[PDB]
Design a binder for this molecule. Sequence first.
Ligand SMILES: Nc1nc2c(ncn2[C@@H]2O[C@H](COP(=O)(O)OP(=O)(O)NP(=O)(O)O)[C@@H](O)[C@H]2O)c(=O)[nH]1
Ligand SMILES: [Mg+2]
Length: 168
Amino acid sequence: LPTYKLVVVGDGGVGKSALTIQFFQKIFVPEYDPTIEDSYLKHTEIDNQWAILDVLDTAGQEEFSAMREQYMRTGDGFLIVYSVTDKASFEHVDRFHQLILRVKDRESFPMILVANKVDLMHLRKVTRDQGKEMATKYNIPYIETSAKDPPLNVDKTFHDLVRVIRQQ
Ligand SMILES: Nc1nc2c(ncn2[C@@H]2O[C@H](COP(=O)(O)OP(=O)(O)NP(=O)(O)O)[C@@H](O)[C@H]2O)c(=O)[nH]1
Ligand SMILES: [Mg+2]
């Protein structure tokens, strides 16, 4: 019974924990801020095939973390998340991409570029074409999400990484 180790990375504040908790626990809690990384594990059915999804919500803190390096090293696919209301997080997407391809020592590896917080329409600084242009440049899928209820593409984001892994 296959296990897909997934890693969520991206700048501080982009929604990594929000997206993750929305996926597993089906909730949005504005006040929830975990300082340290959490992992999560659930059976899940993607296109009629069950899998265990084993997901790390990375915490981007400066200190060394044993768990985090394990997941980075053994991970099957990454979600690279930025926030559409934080232009810096989008500029810093290159850091993450580059980081993932070194740890893995590969030319490509299963990733999705995740443009989050698209409910905050009046604060949107990164446009849809900008994000798609950048997806294209790395040749990886682009998806827009919102962890907030009712969420958008949160389930699809996770299943789509699995899909990417599977059909690779
Ligand atoms: N409206 C809206 N708020 C969101 C969305 N995703 C996250 N937020 C909010 O934005 C803030 C930062 O969320 P958080 O999930 O902790 O970000 P993070 O990526 O885990 N940052 P860190 O690296 O510090 O853990 C929180 O207030 C959270 O409620 C979203 O899609 N829409
Ligand atoms: Mg977090």
